[PDB]
């Protein structure tokens, strides 16, 4: 059943890229200021 697992592997990765995006723009708004 590739649905249940990949659904979690999805959210396990969507949250990962979210944190990376959070800290990436965090560096951006810092240096420009």
């Amino acid at each position: 059943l590739a649905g249940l697992d990949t659904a979690i592997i999805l959210i396990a990765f969507i949250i990962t890229a979210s944190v990376l995006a959070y800290v990436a723009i965090n560096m951006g708004l810092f240096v420009t200021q």
Partner: protein
């Protein structure tokens, strides 16, 4: 049996702790010989869930490869568990009792935060003395002169001393702090309506302060790399890694 185990496996992927603010670092500026403390705030990433920061089920590991040191689980105390009621009164600077803890109220829920690492330090000085009975006091912040402290208590000389002066009731009051072992504590800084629970809610902001002991405080980090790893019980660890060589003043920025 499968359902609960898949359900529990789902909750694991939704912890998502991150780093906020900055990583400050303060040492004796003129003679860069002693290391005093490290303080950085740590928040959840986004509105996903509440993360656990209890000092019983969390590990903070400090290590510096360039000098062969590796500490594990220097996480001992927190100020999240203490209620602001008992802490409200018993601290006397001069004439009047100064209030360290702040609080708000909104949407039917009260909030608790601390304005300074110093006010949070003094609040930590009292709570270890009276709230949670311990025979060894890892920190002892007093107003007596450091020489006088050595006279009244002999074993207060091996620890590393660092001062923080204040201004209460118009008189310049000084303080002295003595740490006998490298430990770390936490205190709420923003959006923590969960006092006493020690569970950082979503989007909250929590502080983390590491006080250097005598064994490690005698070394200064120059051209070295630092690794601080806050490992909760479930989910994502957080490895603070930086490369610094000089203090640039009384305190550093990174």
């Amino acid at each position: 049996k499968a359902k609960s185990t898949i359900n529990k496996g789902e909750e694991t992927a939704s912890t998502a702790l991150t780093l906020s603010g900055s990583v400050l670092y303060a040492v004796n500026y003129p003679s860069n010989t002693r290391s005093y403390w490290i303080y950085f705030t740590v928040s959840p990433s986004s509105g996903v869930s509440s993360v656990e920061l209890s000092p019983s089920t969390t590990a903070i590991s400090f290590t510096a490869s360039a000098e062969g040191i590796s500490y594990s689980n220097i996480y001992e105390y927190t100020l999240l568990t203490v209620s602001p009621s008992e802490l409200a009164n018993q601290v006397y600077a001069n004439g009047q009792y100064l209030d360290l803890v702040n609080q708000q109220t909104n949407a039917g829920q009260t909030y608790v935060y601390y304005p300074n690492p110093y006010y949070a330090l003094l609040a930590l000085n009292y709570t270890l003395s009276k709230i949670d009975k311990v025979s060894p006091s890892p920190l002892y912040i007093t107003t007596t002169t450091p020489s006088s402290a050595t006279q009244i208590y002999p074993f207060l000389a091996h620890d590393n001393m660092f001062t923080f002066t204040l201004n209460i009731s118009g008189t310049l009051v000084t303080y002295y702090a003595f740490v006998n072992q490298t430990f770390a504590f936490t205190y709420p800084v923003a959006g923590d309506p969960l006092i006493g629970s020690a569970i950082a809610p979503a989007g909250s902001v929590i502080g983390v302060m590491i006080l250097f002991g005598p064994d490690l405080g005698s070394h200064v980090f120059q051209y070295q790399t630092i690794t601080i790893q806050i490992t909760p019980n479930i989910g994502s660890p957080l490895t603070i890694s930086e490369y610094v060589y000089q203090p640039e003043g009384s305190v550093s920025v990174i």
